Fold this sequence. Notes:
A: mainly beta, Thrombin, subunit H, six-stranded antiparallel beta barrel, 2 helices, 13 strands, 33% strand, B: little secondary structure, elongated, binds calcium ion
Amino acid sequence: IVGGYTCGANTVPYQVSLNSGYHFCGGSLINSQWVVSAAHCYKSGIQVRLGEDNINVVEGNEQFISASKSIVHPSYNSNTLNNDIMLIKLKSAASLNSRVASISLPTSCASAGTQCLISGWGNTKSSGTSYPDVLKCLKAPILSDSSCKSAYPGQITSNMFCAGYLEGGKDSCQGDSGGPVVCSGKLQGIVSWGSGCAQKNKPGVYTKVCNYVSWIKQTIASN
Amino acid sequence: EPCCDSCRCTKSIPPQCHCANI
Ligand SMILES: [Ca+2]
């Protein structure tokens, strides 16, 4: 997160860290045994670390659970990043409490202007790479589809939405992928792509989860 | 030479810059 702030230990109970000997992507717990992340975050031997703040130190509340399977969206396309969404089944159910809680799937899509909270352990610097030990948070509004598609001509599909600031200085960045974009207590987005980080006229592009609410439900229901 | 024009990059560790130059 570039331009964000320190969330505060366990203040974002649904944030999970995708670890494989290092933090590579983010995710959000939607229930005790299922996590939502980005399809481009997929790799073998994914360990899901819940209840984290400082990813480098063990300070209580962590739950290390291994991915029992990662269900990438059948129609994911690595070039366009369309359908950039992946479900990760946990080997064992996580213990839910005040420090580890699931986030709600939206019932409808959010509107341009809606203030959302984006969080993650991704790069905190646009020009260079500085990673934080603790979870960073950022408040950013969903942009209007016209401003989104104008910034990324022909690259924005109906399953993508822009969130952020056109002036730059505040944006999600590498390491934040798979992370949550929560608006009014509903998981509205998954950190996906963007042209750099916190660059002017280059907002962050996110996976429009409302389009996948039914896919998610059915997939989970059959696994 | 460099990463095209506006290298569309994923925000993963490490990133995937499939670029935007079509
Ligand atoms: Ca820790």
